[PDB]
Amino acid sequence: RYFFERALECYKPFSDTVLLLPCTARKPYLTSRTHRALRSKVKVNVNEIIISSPLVVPREFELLHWSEEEVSFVAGWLKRFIEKGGFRKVVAHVTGGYRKVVERVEDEVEAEVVYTAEKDVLSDESIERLKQEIESKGKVDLYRRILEHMLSYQFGITWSGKVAGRYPELELLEGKKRLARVDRIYGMLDIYEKIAAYLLEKNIYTVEIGDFEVKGTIFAGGVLRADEKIRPNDVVVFHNSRIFGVGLAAMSGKEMAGSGIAINVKRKFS
């Protein structure tokens, strides 16, 4: 519910066309054999949305029996992303139950909806139909959009830098230091000094703490004030008169400044 709503407000397309694809057994979806084979036979320069259940997932957030109720629920969310994205065309490269989901949305959106797959999403006929619908001139840096979207999702900000690492372990670098990196364990971005510094400045996702030596844990009693918008598993930036750091909130911003373990410390800067 939270994922859906937050991703929807942070969703920013770079194309007027969106490609719909089937979810896969292996995740994150971009590393699956099907998605790799597809992107291998056709240069994809339009936005992508992976249809799954119950999750509808724009490719940019992929790192964070089709009953009536299920088709209805998935169609509802898929429609939201299509309309929020303001696409002029929707290319549905999916089959069976997935087409039923898309078929539900087609009748409610202004966008043109074309179907390019019948039986096999990877057949020579399907890839030719697909190419004829999304063929594009140059290229797009999908990795940068993904990292930018995760920053937006988690902190409501964006940042520039060099994109590095092997997918899905991407990083954003500035100078010769990392600004952020994908944490495959927690499925979110870990941030470093410059960003945490920026968040501290704008006083967002910040928590003021007592003047004690920080070591691993910060209990609620050690928290002076905290951003009320802070939710449990959120990355927060704590600080006092001598240091500031990065950690994982264990409780809401309300519980901290209220009345257990408040933050699991990842690192700190002098």
Tab-separated table of C-alpha atoms in Angstrom:
chain	number	residue	atom	x	y	z
A	1	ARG	CA	0.000	0.000	0.000
A	2	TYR	CA	2.810	2.314	1.055
A	3	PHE	CA	5.031	1.156	-1.789
A	4	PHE	CA	2.279	1.792	-4.337
A	5	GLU	CA	1.474	5.281	-3.130
A	6	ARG	CA	5.054	6.439	-2.655
A	7	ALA	CA	6.272	5.010	-5.950
A	8	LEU	CA	3.344	6.671	-7.701
A	9	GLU	CA	4.233	10.133	-6.428
A	10	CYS	CA	7.937	9.682	-7.235
A	11	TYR	CA	7.408	8.136	-10.691
A	12	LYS	CA	8.946	10.253	-13.459
A	13	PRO	CA	9.000	8.809	-17.017
A	14	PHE	CA	11.595	9.726	-19.640
A	15	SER	CA	9.537	8.465	-22.602
A	16	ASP	CA	6.052	8.934	-24.060
A	17	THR	CA	5.796	5.175	-24.565
A	18	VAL	CA	5.692	2.483	-21.880
A	19	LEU	CA	6.506	-1.198	-22.372
A	20	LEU	CA	4.571	-3.711	-20.237
A	21	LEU	CA	6.359	-6.952	-19.361
A	22	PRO	CA	5.645	-10.149	-17.419
A	23	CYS	CA	7.167	-10.677	-13.985
A	24	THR	CA	9.719	-13.486	-13.679
A	25	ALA	CA	10.792	-16.095	-11.123
A	26	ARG	CA	14.221	-14.502	-10.776
A	27	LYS	CA	14.457	-11.005	-9.287
A	28	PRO	CA	15.295	-8.222	-9.543
A	29	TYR	CA	13.488	-8.617	-12.887
A	30	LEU	CA	16.222	-7.012	-15.002
A	31	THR	CA	18.600	-9.906	-14.258
A	32	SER	CA	16.089	-12.584	-15.334
A	33	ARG	CA	16.783	-14.680	-18.425
A	34	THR	CA	13.563	-13.526	-20.101
A	35	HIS	CA	14.160	-9.795	-19.630
A	36	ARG	CA	17.822	-10.160	-20.595
A	37	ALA	CA	16.976	-12.171	-23.740
A	38	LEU	CA	14.378	-9.571	-24.720
A	39	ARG	CA	16.652	-6.572	-24.191
A	40	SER	CA	19.266	-8.537	-26.094
A	41	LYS	CA	17.131	-8.797	-29.232
A	42	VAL	CA	15.709	-5.267	-29.092
A	43	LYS	CA	17.106	-1.952	-27.849
A	44	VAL	CA	14.682	-0.749	-25.195
A	45	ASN	CA	14.500	3.059	-25.022
A	46	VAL	CA	11.050	3.467	-23.524
A	47	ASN	CA	9.807	3.168	-19.941
A	48	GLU	CA	9.043	-0.283	-18.555
A	49	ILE	CA	6.490	-1.592	-16.110
A	50	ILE	CA	6.599	-5.193	-14.933
A	51	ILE	CA	3.154	-6.683	-14.273
A	52	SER	CA	3.011	-8.997	-11.261
A	53	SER	CA	0.689	-9.845	-8.363
A	54	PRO	CA	-0.127	-8.058	-6.209
A	55	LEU	CA	2.659	-5.714	-7.273
A	56	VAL	CA	2.790	-3.553	-10.370
A	57	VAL	CA	6.389	-2.353	-10.680
A	58	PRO	CA	7.904	0.433	-12.770
A	59	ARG	CA	11.391	-0.736	-13.742
A	60	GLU	CA	12.817	2.201	-11.741
A	61	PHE	CA	11.660	0.717	-8.439
A	62	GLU	CA	12.579	-2.917	-9.110
A	63	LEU	CA	15.443	-2.762	-6.572
A	64	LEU	CA	13.389	-1.528	-3.606
A	65	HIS	CA	-4.655	-17.951	-11.390
A	66	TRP	CA	-5.616	-14.357	-12.246
A	67	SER	CA	-8.979	-14.351	-10.487
A	68	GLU	CA	-11.429	-11.469	-10.961
A	69	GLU	CA	-10.427	-9.782	-7.683
A	70	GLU	CA	-6.750	-10.148	-8.585
A	71	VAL	CA	-7.089	-8.846	-12.147
A	72	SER	CA	-9.244	-6.027	-10.795
A	73	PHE	CA	-6.707	-5.083	-8.115
A	74	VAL	CA	-3.665	-5.222	-10.403
A	75	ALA	CA	-5.470	-3.298	-13.169
A	76	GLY	CA	-6.353	-0.549	-10.689
A	77	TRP	CA	-2.720	0.113	-9.798
A	78	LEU	CA	-1.338	-0.418	-13.298
A	79	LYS	CA	-3.771	2.223	-14.571
A	80	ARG	CA	-2.484	4.683	-11.970
A	81	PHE	CA	1.109	4.372	-13.157
A	82	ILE	CA	0.107	4.639	-16.820
A	83	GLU	CA	-1.973	7.762	-16.171
A	84	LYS	CA	0.591	9.306	-13.800
A	85	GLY	CA	3.254	8.683	-16.429
A	86	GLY	CA	1.116	10.448	-19.021
A	87	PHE	CA	2.122	7.994	-21.743
A	88	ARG	CA	0.647	8.416	-25.219
A	89	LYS	CA	1.146	4.738	-25.998
A	90	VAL	CA	1.192	1.486	-24.024
A	91	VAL	CA	2.895	-1.538	-25.608
A	92	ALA	CA	1.642	-4.657	-23.836
A	93	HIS	CA	4.286	-7.331	-24.376
A	94	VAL	CA	2.549	-9.995	-22.330
A	95	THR	CA	0.248	-12.970	-22.821
A	96	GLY	CA	-2.592	-14.867	-21.172
A	97	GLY	CA	-3.737	-13.671	-17.768
A	98	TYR	CA	-1.547	-10.580	-18.131
A	99	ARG	CA	-3.399	-9.420	-21.228
A	100	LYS	CA	-6.617	-9.621	-19.221
A	101	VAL	CA	-5.128	-7.154	-16.743
A	102	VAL	CA	-4.091	-4.786	-19.550
A	103	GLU	CA	-7.392	-5.252	-21.356
A	104	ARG	CA	-9.142	-3.903	-18.260
A	105	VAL	CA	-6.995	-0.755	-18.307
A	106	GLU	CA	-7.061	-0.182	-22.065
A	107	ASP	CA	-10.752	0.750	-21.882
A	108	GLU	CA	-10.122	3.386	-19.215
A	109	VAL	CA	-7.043	5.254	-20.468
A	110	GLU	CA	-6.568	7.789	-23.283
A	111	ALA	CA	-3.324	6.150	-24.394
A	112	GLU	CA	-3.231	3.899	-27.441
A	113	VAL	CA	-2.766	0.297	-26.351
A	114	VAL	CA	-1.098	-2.182	-28.691
A	115	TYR	CA	-0.464	-5.891	-28.087
A	116	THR	CA	2.767	-7.360	-29.458
A	117	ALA	CA	2.840	-10.876	-28.024
A	118	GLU	CA	0.722	-13.936	-28.796
A	119	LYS	CA	1.829	-17.219	-27.183
A	120	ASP	CA	5.507	-16.364	-26.678
A	121	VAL	CA	7.033	-13.032	-25.648
A	122	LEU	CA	10.377	-14.241	-27.053
A	123	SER	CA	9.334	-15.574	-30.493
A	124	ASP	CA	10.807	-14.084	-33.681
A	125	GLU	CA	7.329	-12.864	-34.556
A	126	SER	CA	6.805	-11.229	-31.162
A	127	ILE	CA	10.185	-9.479	-31.224
A	128	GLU	CA	9.494	-8.191	-34.748
A	129	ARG	CA	6.094	-6.833	-33.660
A	130	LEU	CA	7.750	-5.279	-30.622
A	131	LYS	CA	10.520	-3.630	-32.654
A	132	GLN	CA	7.905	-2.154	-34.950
A	133	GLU	CA	6.239	-0.442	-31.975
A	134	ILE	CA	9.199	0.829	-29.910
A	135	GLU	CA	12.090	1.244	-32.377
A	136	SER	CA	14.080	4.304	-31.232
A	137	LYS	CA	17.024	6.411	-32.428
A	138	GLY	CA	19.588	6.632	-29.604
A	139	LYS	CA	19.997	5.291	-26.073
A	140	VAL	CA	18.990	5.867	-22.444
A	141	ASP	CA	20.876	5.399	-19.194
A	142	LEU	CA	18.399	3.248	-17.278
A	143	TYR	CA	20.797	2.731	-14.345
A	144	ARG	CA	20.864	6.439	-13.529
A	145	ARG	CA	17.049	6.679	-13.597
A	146	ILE	CA	16.840	3.735	-11.178
A	147	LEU	CA	19.251	5.297	-8.689
A	148	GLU	CA	17.582	8.701	-9.028
A	149	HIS	CA	14.177	7.112	-8.383
A	150	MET	CA	15.394	5.307	-5.269
A	151	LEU	CA	16.747	8.553	-3.805
A	152	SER	CA	13.420	10.225	-4.594
A	153	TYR	CA	11.488	7.316	-3.079
A	154	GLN	CA	13.507	7.203	0.166
A	155	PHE	CA	14.380	10.871	0.694
A	156	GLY	CA	12.373	12.926	-1.774
A	157	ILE	CA	15.557	14.323	-3.320
A	158	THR	CA	17.831	13.627	-6.269
A	159	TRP	CA	21.575	13.805	-6.885
A	160	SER	CA	24.135	13.691	-9.676
A	161	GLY	CA	27.252	11.579	-10.059
A	162	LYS	CA	28.960	8.700	-11.824
A	163	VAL	CA	26.992	5.448	-11.942
A	164	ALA	CA	29.100	2.351	-11.261
A	165	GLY	CA	29.127	-1.296	-10.241
A	166	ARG	CA	27.553	-4.410	-11.733
A	167	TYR	CA	23.744	-4.537	-11.660
A	168	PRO	CA	21.957	-4.870	-9.255
A	169	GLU	CA	24.839	-3.655	-7.061
A	170	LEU	CA	24.877	-0.122	-8.455
A	171	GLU	CA	26.640	2.863	-6.892
A	172	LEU	CA	26.695	6.608	-7.442
A	173	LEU	CA	30.112	8.223	-7.135
A	174	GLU	CA	31.392	11.799	-6.867
A	175	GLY	CA	35.091	12.562	-6.940
A	176	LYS	CA	36.622	9.322	-5.730
A	177	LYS	CA	34.093	8.627	-2.987
A	178	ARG	CA	30.698	6.925	-3.078
A	179	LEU	CA	27.557	8.979	-2.557
A	180	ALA	CA	25.206	6.027	-2.332
A	181	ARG	CA	24.954	2.336	-3.178
A	182	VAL	CA	22.313	-0.359	-3.490
A	183	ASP	CA	22.122	-2.598	-0.407
A	184	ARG	CA	20.855	-5.924	-1.774
A	185	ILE	CA	20.163	-7.090	1.789
A	186	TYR	CA	17.706	-4.383	2.829
A	187	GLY	CA	16.537	-3.590	-0.701
A	188	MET	CA	17.201	0.146	-0.456
A	189	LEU	CA	19.897	2.775	-0.948
A	190	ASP	CA	22.632	3.236	1.616
A	191	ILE	CA	23.896	6.850	1.692
A	192	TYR	CA	27.195	8.438	2.686
A	193	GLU	CA	28.596	11.794	3.887
A	194	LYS	CA	27.594	14.373	1.256
A	195	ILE	CA	23.982	13.218	1.020
A	196	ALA	CA	23.508	12.752	4.773
A	197	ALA	CA	25.034	16.239	5.097
A	198	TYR	CA	22.483	17.593	2.645
A	199	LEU	CA	19.578	15.905	4.474
A	200	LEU	CA	20.878	17.255	7.798
A	201	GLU	CA	20.962	20.764	6.304
A	202	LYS	CA	17.392	20.607	5.037
A	203	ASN	CA	16.530	19.110	8.420
A	204	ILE	CA	14.710	16.118	6.917
A	205	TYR	CA	14.893	12.480	8.073
A	206	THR	CA	17.040	13.866	10.871
A	207	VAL	CA	17.203	12.976	14.543
A	208	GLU	CA	18.954	15.003	17.234
A	209	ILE	CA	20.718	12.928	19.874
A	210	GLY	CA	22.506	13.377	23.187
A	211	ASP	CA	26.207	14.144	23.540
A	212	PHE	CA	27.432	10.564	23.965
A	213	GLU	CA	29.923	8.389	22.058
A	214	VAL	CA	27.867	6.576	19.411
A	215	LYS	CA	28.533	2.837	19.134
A	216	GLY	CA	26.252	0.512	17.182
A	217	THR	CA	22.989	1.435	18.917
A	218	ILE	CA	21.083	4.578	19.921
A	219	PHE	CA	18.205	3.978	22.337
A	220	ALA	CA	15.067	6.120	22.443
A	221	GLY	CA	16.227	7.763	25.658
A	222	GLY	CA	19.231	9.158	23.796
A	223	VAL	CA	17.069	10.902	21.197
A	224	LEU	CA	16.356	14.583	21.854
A	225	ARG	CA	14.140	15.381	18.857
A	226	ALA	CA	13.205	13.478	15.690
A	227	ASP	CA	11.486	14.076	12.342
A	228	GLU	CA	7.852	13.039	12.853
A	229	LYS	CA	7.757	11.797	9.257
A	230	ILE	CA	10.351	9.144	10.127
A	231	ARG	CA	9.061	5.583	9.850
A	232	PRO	CA	10.679	2.359	11.150
A	233	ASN	CA	12.945	0.898	8.426
A	234	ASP	CA	13.802	4.409	7.178
A	235	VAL	CA	17.375	5.587	6.692
A	236	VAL	CA	17.850	8.545	9.017
A	237	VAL	CA	20.623	11.022	9.714
A	238	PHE	CA	21.347	11.479	13.425
A	239	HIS	CA	23.471	14.290	14.880
A	240	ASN	CA	24.741	16.225	17.929
A	241	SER	CA	27.322	18.971	18.550
A	242	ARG	CA	30.297	16.824	17.508
A	243	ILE	CA	29.061	14.344	14.904
A	244	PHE	CA	26.371	13.260	12.503
A	245	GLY	CA	25.775	9.843	11.007
A	246	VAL	CA	23.654	7.386	9.062
A	247	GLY	CA	21.471	4.626	10.479
A	248	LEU	CA	18.290	2.566	10.166
A	249	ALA	CA	15.372	3.802	12.250
A	250	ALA	CA	13.812	1.080	14.407
A	251	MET	CA	10.771	3.114	15.436
A	252	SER	CA	8.680	5.997	14.093
A	253	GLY	CA	9.859	9.567	14.481
A	254	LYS	CA	7.039	9.844	17.019
A	255	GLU	CA	8.156	6.926	19.203
A	256	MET	CA	11.703	8.311	19.369
A	257	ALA	CA	10.733	11.761	20.601
A	258	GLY	CA	8.093	9.931	22.614
A	259	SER	CA	8.387	7.242	25.275
A	260	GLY	CA	13.645	0.359	23.075
A	261	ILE	CA	16.229	0.609	20.297
A	262	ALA	CA	15.690	3.788	18.285
A	263	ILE	CA	18.370	3.501	15.597
A	264	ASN	CA	20.780	0.871	14.300
A	265	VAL	CA	23.915	2.886	13.469
A	266	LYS	CA	25.613	2.267	10.129
A	267	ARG	CA	28.285	4.956	10.312
A	268	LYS	CA	29.248	8.386	11.606
A	269	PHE	CA	31.344	11.370	10.597
A	270	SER	CA	33.524	13.642	12.765
